[PDB]
């Protein structure tokens, strides 16, 4: 019923109030996003948008949540979708 | 000692076995060997379970599973303390322990092994005012408790100890500048999928549940509130109650205000017989609760004490009798009690309900005495629904007509009265606020004055809110819509897009539709074009000059067949392939099509495209204005264009060829072809190399009596030669040409004298001459003054970006005093003027009643010069209607004088964008 | 997963119109665009390899 | 500055306080998301060539916000990528975010004070790296030049570059990961950021490194000596020296051409070709000392501040003055975003944010 995440000092508190949620296959999310947790931090700084992954539907769907401006959310979403499409080819 | 304390804690409160808690356990380990945090702040929305998390931390420590390296973990509860009391840190620590003063003295001997957990620190924002306070550094000094917390946070007291704090996203605003290098952790309540599943189970099967479901979960302000389990439960209970009441419930079933009103009013009616009022005492109690909530919201306060209840004549028994739901929870085991609403969203609802009941009586005689206002604002806007106010009328036995409704209407109207366009963000915010009211009359009365709208569509719910609110914008004439990446790539989204398109294709006063920077897929364009085919659509103007709609152009050629109100089409920057060109030409040839203007700037036209355009030009069409700017026109394409324009079947009246790469050969071809043309009246050849031969050929064309040219634009073409002799001789014997523009050509005083001499002839009927950045100097100002005195037809003269100087302007002002002039517009922007010439300008402006417009930007006027010019502007005889200035460049004195100028003459516009106003289609080519 | 690798590259905030060129970063030294890999790890590795080959 | 949301909130507040007693309007466009003001640009008298489109030049400045530092203001920085403003003074550095939709800010994101007790310890300069990942500070009586990492989850002092016994006057930073500084005695130390090891020391006359500019392998300095010196990084020898008619109170370099812009103490702007190193053009004189200069990202205009009340914008290459916006006192500092949308100027004890109208 609770999930914890770390908010970098540089991310405004005004931008955790309207996330963007999209769903995709779980294994695709594992292949693309990975698990290093430092690669993900670097790419978050680059896009200026936070990213989270949570397994849903018995491990067949992931709930990707993206925070930031609408433009930052669009940038992060498009990067993820491009990589995923590469995988699905 | 220690084990006894652990036992006491376990008894009071009764870990590390879940992936969530390990983060808290590990948050006190080095980041990269250079940093180790000593302060963690957990923040989140109300009701997500943060106090439970803190208590779990302490319990896990006492049991020996978390932070085992710490020697002591203290716990503070911010609610249950009196911040105005005077105490010392030692007493506060001892309160928790069983009066083990020896242990407390022993605790302070190892500060580096200490840990404080502070809970609910948000409530103290009202006392942590914008001011400094004494910084304590000892644990034995008696200071106010809020001073103790303020000193502990800044690590001036016990600087070596660890801290953990929980607070609300809205309380961080003053902590963040107080703590030193904190680590922030975001606590999130229910997941999105769980909230969706919970809401989807309580909608009525028989009714159209999908629409209400998607209108509930797509509202980000409502949906994000449902992270708290308590708010989700309230929403579910309200949905079930509305289902149970069947047709007895007339309140809205989508807005959160509707659900909260259902919940609160259903309880209030339980004691009463069906449809009967409340007593006077109960009315007093309800109004007092509402006033207390409103005052708490305004003063950044959310915990109330027995003193506050007395001020508003409240009692827990009375409140529990009114509502059986026990709205005011009582918290605090101390002999002094503390009260908090069941949720922080219920304080907003009761705060906004005060603006609706404050006017029914003189309640005050009975009583003894940002981001936090967003919820109250939404509730206040949603309480103006009439089905809701009927219940209040029943309860209070009196008509309810709040005086705030007029204020909200006035605000929404003030949004749309802005002059330099409307702000898309304020427009969307107002549309979100007006969607909560759900009252057709109030909404329609709010949106009366919206004559133009600029929207910015980012989420799905912006489509629904816009469709709802746009349906009542009857005086809407133009609209711009920016949709970046929402419809870019290929369903609820398509359905809401279709509804939005249907709403646009039904307004009767809508003339212009601009698509901004939208990126539309093929299917989105298909839906838009299908919806614009409607016979109720009156849209004349259509603009795609900044959008990417290449993949679905074929749906626009079919729209050209049917919609017969369409007259203007802009396709700038859209690549145009051969097949698309053929289809567009066939659409423009159709007898039903009525497109008069067609812009194809930067469309990458090929030779075959030019052949198709040439064939179109002679066919029977209604096309009158054509633009081919920024397209490379070759020799063969120019031959085809000439063969089209030399015919007598071509009725084109305007032609823009700006920056088409014309050369003297192509220009010769063009002007030779134009000799037989009788219909063309506007011609633009800007940003091309003409030459003396080209100017001579153009003058030869002008001489022909069959010629019809009225406007000729030659910006950035000519060369320093005798080509200005040809034009000068041609002007003196011309009766048709009215506008000539020679901007950014090297004319100079030598050619300026010839042009002035030609203009002085009474046979010349020229009306506007543009000489912006033409290399004139102070030598030609005498000729200009003589010509301004002498002529009878010239009405516009632009001399911007010319170094006339103070002496040049003083010379020119001798011809602006005379009453024999007829000049109405004068440009003097960026002419290197100073305060030296302000006397001459002031005299001319005072003594001239015909001047209507004047430009003065990019010069350097001092305070005294501007004061003289302002005194001149105030003169009764001056008739200036447009003045070119930037009022932000001058001191306060000059600015107040300019305001007085605007006051004395209410029709004067003082705006620095001087080229925005064109009374006579001056920018027919730039568009 | 090196932080110094990304300190040399830049992402344009403005989304490109062509959405197949979205996962590409521009070097702050030479201006070359490197990207298009199917993963975060591969993308960072390509950044490092370009740096080593061309610059350091 | 007045906005619509504040209009409504003030109206509601006034109504509420009115009901509890006895017992068109001009708005400013908001700075959306701390990124952009959604507006329409001014009209021009003519179009532009194919390739001249991006030769934009500003028309006016619109004031949008005020940041309430509570001490005399020395240096201002800003990042368009992260939307952070760094305002510096003697006591410390305050960090403000541009997303806070207000008209008078008083709550910074943080406050960075010096680990050494401020008594006889002062800051005098600050610098933000080009990629917005690092922040530098220097001043009197410090054991080094403080370095902060801004890309980490928390804001903490990363390292220190040792400069014991000196006073920092100017700072610079190169994409190659080098770090430069200039001291009152004329030294110019070059550190390595990876290892914090001193790599070079260029010793010049006293008060000659008051201003420092780096481009390619060159280090242009100028100060009260009134001469402009160029030091070669990989030869460590003064490769040039040109003398001017007044003290060099500021420097700047074009980001797209070879023009070096100087602001002297008597009020003149001089343009110097950094490659030919022969031409020295003079631009019309201001009436007061020039304390700041900076080229626009495209290099087609520049702004200047000084001991006067005005902020002036000039055009290249002729130095023609476009417009002028007044203030209340000497404008010590200013900065410009890398997208050419905002300009932030520090005067007295507060920093003003302006919107550049094109
Ligand atoms: Zn590179």
Beta-carbon separation of A14 and D110 below 8 A: no
Q: Nearest C-alpha of chain A: how many angstroms from D158? A: 15
What does the DSSP assignment read for B18-53? SHHHHHHHHTTS-SSSS---SEEEEEE-TTSSHHHH
Contact call for residues D259 and D301 (beta carbons, < 8 A): no
Residue A57 lies inside a defined structural domain of this protein? yes
Domains with residue ranges and CATH for chain B: 2-186 (3.40.50), 191-249 (no CATH), 250-369+372-402 (no CATH), 681-775 (3.80.10.10), 784-927 (3.80.10.10)
Query: Taking CB atoms and an 8 Å cutoff, what residues of chain C touch D178?
Result: none
List Cβ neighbours of B877 (8 Å cut-off, separation of 6 or more): B846, B847, B849
Q: Does A1 touch chain B (CB under 8 A)?
A: yes
Beta-carbon separation of D153 and B183 below 8 A: yes
Q: Does residue C20 sit in helix, strand or coil?
A: helix
Residue A70 lies inside a defined structural domain of this protein? yes
Q: Which residues of B carry a binding-site annotation?
A: 44-51
Round to whole Å and give the CA distance between A39 and B755. 70
* Best CA proximity match to B700, nearest among B739, B668, B735, B664: B668
Tell me the torsion sign for CA atoms B829, B835, B837, B841: positive
Prior bond of B803 cis (ω within 30°): no
Q: Which residues of B carry a binding-site annotation for ATP?
A: 44-51
Residue A49 lies inside a defined structural domain of this protein? yes
Beta strands B541-543 and B512-514: pairing type? parallel
Round to whole Å and give the CA distance between B907 and B852. 11
Please name the chains neighbouring A, where neighbouring means 3+ C-beta pairs under 8 angstroms. B, C, D
Round to whole Å and give the CA distance between D341 and D36. 8
Give B88: exposed, middle or buried? Use CB within 10 Å, 0-12, 13-18, 19+. middle
Give B685: exposed, middle or buried? Use CB within 10 Å, 0-12, 13-18, 19+. buried
- Which residue in C3, C13, C28 is closest to D175 by CB distance? C28
Round to whole Å and give the CA distance between B601 and B140. 80
Give B636: exposed, middle or buried? Use CB within 10 Å, 0-12, 13-18, 19+. exposed
Query: Taking CB atoms and an 8 Å cutoff, what residues of chain B touch D110?
Result: 176-177
Tell me the torsion sign for CA atoms B350, B353, B355, B360: negative
Beta-carbon separation of C15 and B485 below 8 A: yes
* Best CA proximity match to D111, nearest among D130, D126, D127, D91: D91
Q: Does D150 touch chain A (CB under 8 A)?
A: yes
* Best CA proximity match to B758, nearest among B782, B781, B724: B724
Query: Taking CB atoms and an 8 Å cutoff, what residues of chain B touch D155?
Result: 181
Please name the chains neighbouring B, where neighbouring means 3+ C-beta pairs under 8 angstroms. A, C, D
Cβ-based neighbour number of residue B585 at 10 Å: 18
What's the total number of domains in chain A?
A: 1
Q: Which residue has the tokens 């000489």?
A: B771
Q: What angle do CA C30, C36, C37 make, to 5 degrees?
A: 115
Query: Taking CB atoms and an 8 Å cutoff, what residues of chain B touch A54?
Result: 191
Beta-carbon separation of C11 and A46 below 8 A: yes
Distances (CA, A) of A85 to A80, B523, C19, D98: 9, 21, 12, 36
What single-letter DSSP state applies at residue D105? B
What single-letter DSSP state applies at residue B474? T
Residue A31 lies inside a defined structural domain of this protein? yes
Q: Which residue has the tokens 């990961």?
A: D177
Residue D307 CA from chain centroid, whole number: 16
Probe site for chain B from C16, C18, C19 (most B CB atoms < 10 A): C19
Residues having C-beta closer than 5 Å to ion ligand 1:
C 27, 29-30, 32
Query: Taking CB atoms and an 8 Å cutoff, what residues of chain A touch D97?
Result: 12
Q: Does C3 touch chain D (CB under 8 A)?
A: yes
* Ligand 1 center–CA C51 separation, angstroms: 6
Residue A27 lies inside a defined structural domain of this protein? yes
List, in sequence order, every residue forming a beta bridge with D342; answer none if it has no partner.
Answer: D355
Round to whole Å and give the CA distance between B911 and B416. 19
Q: What is the side-by-side order of every strand in the sheet holding B338-341?
A: B304-305, B338-341, B328-331
* Best CA proximity match to D129, nearest among D150, D143, D112: D150
Distances (CA, A) of B405 to A53, B260, B383: 45, 20, 10
CATH of the domain at A22: 3.30.1370.10
* Ligand 1 center–CA B414 separation, angstroms: 52
Q: What is the side-by-side order of every strand in the sheet holding D331-336?
A: D60-67, D350-357, D342-347, D331-336
Distances (CA, A) of B493 to A73, B498, B515: 18, 9, 18
Q: What are phi and psi of B795, to 5 degrees?
A: -125, -20
Chain D residue at shortest CA distance from C12: D81
- The tokens for B206 are 């028989």
Beta-carbon separation of A71 and C15 below 8 A: yes
Binding-face residues of D in 57-96 toward B, CB within 8 A = 59-63, 94
Residue A44 lies inside a defined structural domain of this protein? yes
- The tokens for A44 are 């978050």
List Cβ neighbours of B825 (8 Å cut-off, separation of 6 or more): B768, B795, B796, B797, B798, B852, B853, B854
Q: Does D38 touch chain A (CB under 8 A)?
A: no
Q: Does C13 touch chain D (CB under 8 A)?
A: yes
Beta-carbon separation of C28 and D133 below 8 A: no
Q: What is the side-by-side order of every strand in the sheet holding D280-283?
A: D248-253, D259-264, D269-273, D280-283
Query: Taking CB atoms and an 8 Å cutoff, what residues of chain A touch B458?
Result: 70
Beta strands B568-570 and B541-543: pairing type? parallel
Chain B residue at shortest CA distance from A20: B459
Beta-carbon separation of C19 and B484 below 8 A: no
Give B26: exposed, middle or buried? Use CB within 10 Å, 0-12, 13-18, 19+. exposed
Contact call for residues D150 and D112 (beta carbons, < 8 A): no
- Cβ-count burial B729-752 (b if 16+ within 10 Å, e if not): ebbbebeebbbbbbbbbebbbebb
DSSP element (H, E) containing D10: helix D4-19
Beta-carbon separation of D150 and A10 below 8 A: yes
Residue A79 belongs to domain spanning: 18-88
Beta-carbon separation of B176 and D109 below 8 A: yes
Resolution of the determined structure in angstroms stands at 3.0
Residue A28 lies inside a defined structural domain of this protein? yes
Q: Does residue D243 sit in helix, strand or coil?
A: strand
Distances (CA, A) of D277 to A86, B858, D241, D274: 53, 33, 10, 5
Q: Which residue has the tokens 């004329």?
A: D186
Cβ-based neighbour number of residue D21 at 10 Å: 7
Residue A11 lies inside a defined structural domain of this protein? no
Chain A residue at shortest CA distance from C22: A79
């Amino acid at each position: 019923s609770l999930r914890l995440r770390t908010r970098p000092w540089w991310f405004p508190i005004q931008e955790v109030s309207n996330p963007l949620v999209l769903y995709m296959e779980a294994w695709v999310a594992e292949r693309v996003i990975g698990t290093d947790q430092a690669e993900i931090s670097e790419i978050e700084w680059m896009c200026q948008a936070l990213l989270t992954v949570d397994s849903v539907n018995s491990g067949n769907l992931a709930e990707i949540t993206i925070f930031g401006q609408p433009s930052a959310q669009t940038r992060m979403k498009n990067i993820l979708l491009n990589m995923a499409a590469w995988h699905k080819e | 000692d220690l084990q006894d304390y652990k036992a006491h804690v376990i008894a009071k409160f009764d870990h590390y076995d879940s992936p969530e808690m390990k983060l808290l356990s590990d948050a006190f380990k080095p980041y990269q060997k250079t940093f180790q945090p000593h302060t963690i702040i957990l923040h989140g929305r109300p009701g997500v379970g943060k106090s439970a998390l803190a208590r779990s931390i302490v319990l896990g420590w006492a049991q020996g599973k978390l932070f085992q390296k710490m020697s002591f973990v203290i716990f503070f509860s911010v609610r249950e303390i009196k911040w105005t009391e005077k105490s010392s840190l030692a007493q506060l620590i001892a309160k928790e322990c069983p009066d083990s003063w020896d242990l407390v003295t022993k605790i302070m001997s190892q500060p580096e092994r200490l840990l404080f957990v502070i809970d609910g620190l948000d409530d103290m924002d009202s006392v942590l005012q914008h001011d400094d306070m004494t910084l304590s550094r000892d644990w034995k000094d008696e200071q106010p408790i809020y001073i103790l917390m303020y000193s502990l946070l800044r690590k001036a007291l016990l600087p070596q100890s660890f801290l953990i704090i929980t607070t609300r996203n809205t309380g961080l605003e003053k902590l963040k500048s107080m703590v030193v290098s904190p680590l922030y952790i975001l606590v999130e309540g229910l997941s999105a999928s769980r909230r969706s599943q919970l809401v989807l189970e309580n909608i009525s099967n028989e009714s159209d549940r999908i629409q209400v479901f998607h209108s509930l979960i797509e509202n980000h302000q409502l949906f994000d509130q449902c992270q708290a389990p308590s708010v989700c439960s309230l929403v579910c209970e309200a949905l079930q109650l509305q289902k149970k009441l069947g047709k007895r419930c007339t309140l809205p079933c989508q807005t959160l205000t509707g659900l909260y009103a259902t919940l609160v009013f259903h309880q209030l009616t339980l004691k009463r017989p069906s449809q009967s009022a409340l007593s006077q005492e109960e009315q007093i109690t309800l109004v007092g609760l509402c006033m207390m909530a409103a005052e708490g919201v305004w003063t950044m306060r959310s915990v109330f004490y027995d003193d506050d209840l007395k001020n508003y004549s409240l009692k827990e028994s009375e409140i529990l009798a009114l509502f059986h739901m026990n709205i005011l929870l009582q918290v605090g085991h101390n002999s002094e009690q503390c009260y908090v609403f069941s949720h922080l969203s219920l304080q907003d609802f009761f705060a906004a309900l005060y603006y609706v009941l404050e006017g029914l009586e003189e309640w005050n005689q009975h009583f003894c005495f940002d981001t936090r206002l967003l919820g109250m604002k939404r509730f206040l806007f949603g309480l103006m629904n009439k089905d809701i106010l009927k219940t209040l009328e029943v309860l209070f036995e009196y008509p309810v007509i709040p005086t705030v409704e007029q204020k909200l209407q006035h605000w929404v109207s003030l949004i749309a009265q802005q002059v330099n366009g409307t702000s898309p963000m304020d427009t969307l915010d107002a549309f979100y606020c007006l969607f909560e009211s759900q009252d057709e009359e109030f909404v329609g009365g709010a949106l009366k004055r919206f004559q133009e709208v600029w929207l910015l569509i980012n989420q799905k719910m912006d489509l629904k809110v816009s469709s709802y609110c746009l349906k009542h914008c009857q005086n809407l004439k133009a609209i711009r819509v920016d949709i970046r990446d929402l419809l870019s790539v290929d369903p609820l989204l398509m359905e809401w897009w279709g509804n939005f398109c249907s709403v646009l294709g039904s307004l009767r006063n809508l003339k212009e539709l601009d698509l901004g920077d939208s990126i539309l897929s093929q299917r989105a364009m298909k839906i838009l074009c299908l919806e614009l085919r409607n016979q109720s659509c009156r849209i004349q103007k259509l603009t795609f000059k900044s959008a990417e709609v290449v993949s679905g152009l074929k749906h626009l050629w079919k729209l050209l067949f049917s919609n017969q109100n369409l007259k203007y089409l802009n396709l700038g920057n859209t690549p145009m392939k051969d097949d698309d060109m053929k289809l567009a030409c066939e659409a423009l040839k159709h007898p039903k099509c009525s497109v008069e203007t067609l812009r194809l700037d930067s469309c990458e036209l090929t030779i075959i495209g030019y052949e198709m355009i040439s064939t179109l030009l002679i066919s029977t069409t209604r096309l009158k204005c054509l633009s081919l700017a920024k397209n490379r026109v070759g020799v063969k394409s120019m031959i085809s264009l000439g063969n089209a324009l030399s015919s007598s079947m071509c009725l084109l009246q305007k032609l823009i060829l700006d920056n088409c790469g014309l050369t003297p050969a192509s220009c010769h071809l063009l002007v030779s072809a134009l000799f037989s043309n009788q219909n063309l009246t506007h011609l633009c050849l800007s940003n091309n190399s003409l030459g003396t031969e080209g100017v001579q050929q153009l003058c030869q064309f002008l001489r022909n009596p069959e010629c019809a040219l009225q406007r000729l634009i030659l910006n950035h073409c000519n060369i320093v030669d005798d080509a200005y002799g040809f034009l000068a001789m041609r002007l003196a014997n011309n009766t048709k040409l009215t506008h000539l523009s020679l901007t950014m050509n090297p004319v100079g005083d030598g050619a300026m004298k010839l042009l002035c001499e030609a203009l002085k002839e009474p046979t010349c009927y020229l009306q506007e001459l543009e000489l912006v950045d033409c290399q004139l100097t102070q030598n030609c100002c005498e000729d200009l003054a003589c010509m301004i005195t002498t002529t009878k037809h010239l009405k516009s003269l632009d001399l911007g970006n010319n170094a006339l100087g103070d002496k040049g302007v003083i010379t020119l002002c001798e011809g602006l005093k005379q009453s024999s002039s007829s000049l109405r517009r004068l440009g003097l922007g960026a002419c290197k003027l100073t305060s030296n010439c302000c006397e001459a300008l002031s005299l001319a402006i005072s003594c001239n009643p015909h001047l209507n417009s004047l430009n003065l930007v990019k010069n350097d006027f001092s305070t005294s010069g501007m004061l003289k010019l302002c005194s001149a502007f105030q003169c009764p005889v001056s008739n200036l209607g447009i003045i070119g200035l930037w009022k932000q460049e001058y001191y306060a004195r000059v600015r107040r004088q300019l305001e007085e100028v605007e006051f004395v003459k209410p029709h004067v516009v003082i705006d620095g964008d001087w080229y925005a106003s064109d009374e006579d289609d001056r920018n027919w080519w730039k568009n | 997963s090196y932080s110094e690798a990304w300190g040399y590259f830049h992402l344009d905030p403005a989304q490109p119109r062509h959405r197949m060129m979205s996962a590409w970063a521009t070097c702050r030294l030479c201006g070359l665009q490197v990207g298009g890999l199917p993963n975060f790890q591969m993308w960072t590795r390509a950044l490092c390899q370009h740096l080593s080959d061309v610059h350091l | 500055p007045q906005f619509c949301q504040g209009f409504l909130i003030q109206g509601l507040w006034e109504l509420f306080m009115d009901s509890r007693q006895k017992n068109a309007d001009k708005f400013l466009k908001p700075l959306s998301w701390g990124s952009e003001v959604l507006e329409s640009s001014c009209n021009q008298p003519s179009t532009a060539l194919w390739q001249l489109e991006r030769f934009t030049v500003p028309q006016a400045l619109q004031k949008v916000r005020v940041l309430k530092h509570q001490e005399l203001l020395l240096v201002v920085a800003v990042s368009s990528f992260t939307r952070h403003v760094f305002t510096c003074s003697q006591s410390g550095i305050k960090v403000w975010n541009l997303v806070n939709q207000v008209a008078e800010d008083r709550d910074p994101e943080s406050h960075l004070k010096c680990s050494v007790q401020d008594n006889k310890v002062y800051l005098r300069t600050c610098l933000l790296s080009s990629n917005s990942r690092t922040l530098f500070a220097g001043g009197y009586n410090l054991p080094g030049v403080i370095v902060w990492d801004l890309a980490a989850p928390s804001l903490y002092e990363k390292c220190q570059l040792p400069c014991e016994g000196l006073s920092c006057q100017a700072l610079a930073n190169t994409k190659e990961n080098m770090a430069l500084a200039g001291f009152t005695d004329g030294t110019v130390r070059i550190w390595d950021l990876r290892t914090q090891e001193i790599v070079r020391n260029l010793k010049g006359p006293t008060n000659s490194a008051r201003n420092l500019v780096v481009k390619d392998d060159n280090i242009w300095t100028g100060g009260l000596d009134a001469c402009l010196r160029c030091w070669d990084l990989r030869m460590a020898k003064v490769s040039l020296e040109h003398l001017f008619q007044s003290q060099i109170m500021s420097l700047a370099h074009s980001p797209t051409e070879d023009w070096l812009l100087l602001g002297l103490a008597n009020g003149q702007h001089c343009l110097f070709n950094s490659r030919k190193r022969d031409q020295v053009l003079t631009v019309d004189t201001k009436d007061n000392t020039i304390l700041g200069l900076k080229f626009s990202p495209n290099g087609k205009w520049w702004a200047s501040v000084g001991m006067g009340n005005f902020i002036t914008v000039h055009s290249m290459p002729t130095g023609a003055k476009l417009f002028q916006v007044p203030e209340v006192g000497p404008v010590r500092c200013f900065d410009m975003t890398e997208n050419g949308r905002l300009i932030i100027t520090g005067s007295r004890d507060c920093a003003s944010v302006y919107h550049i109208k094109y």
